[PDB]
Amino acid sequence: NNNYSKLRSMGYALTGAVQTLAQISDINDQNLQQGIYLLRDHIVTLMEATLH
Amino acid sequence: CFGVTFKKPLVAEEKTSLEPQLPHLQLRLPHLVGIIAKIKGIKIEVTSSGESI
Numbered sequence: 232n233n234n235y236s237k238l239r240s241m242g243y244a245l246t247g248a249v250q251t252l253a254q255i256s257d258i259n260d261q262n263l264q265q266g267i268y269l270l271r272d273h274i275v276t277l278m279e280a281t282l283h
Numbered sequence: 284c285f286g287v288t289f290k291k292p293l294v295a296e297e298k299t300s301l302e303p304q305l306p307h308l309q310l311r312l313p314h315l316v317g318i319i320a321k322i323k324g325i326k327i328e329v330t331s332s333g334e335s336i
């Protein structure tokens with residue numbers, strides 16, 4: 232119950248949240264980019280044949 | 284017989300069937316339904332950020 236101790240403990244928790252939030256943000260952004268790339272590739276493949 | 288020559292009668296085919304030749308365009312867009320089906324199932328996954336933290 233030291234005045235510094237229950238502050239050090241909260242300092243421990245106040246950084247894993249930031250780290251995990253960054254990780255989830257990166258995962259979401261990468262998934263969105265991959266989906267967009269797959270969609271554009273399929274669209275181009277479909278688009279060539281009708282022109283020909 | 285005498286001076287004239289005689290030839291046998293000719294048999295005739297009774298029926299004929301007409302099957303005309305048709306040009307082949309060879310279009311490529313048809314029979315590409317699989318690509319459309321693949322486009323249908325993109326399935327982008329997004330996980331909520333902050334619910335875990």
Ligand SMILES: *[C@@H]1O[C@H](CO)[C@@H](O[C@@H]2O[C@H](CO)[C@@H](O)[C@H](O)[C@H]2NC(C)=O)[C@H](O)[C@H]1NC(C)=O
Nearest residue numbers: 302303304305306307308309310311313314315
């Ligand atoms: C109708 O479809 C058939 C099958 O796709 C076509 O037949 C093909 O024709 C090509 C070009 O001569 C050949 O290389 C293939 O071997 C044929 N496949 C078969 C299974 O016969 C046919 O040409 C099409 N008809 C038209 C008018 O395009």
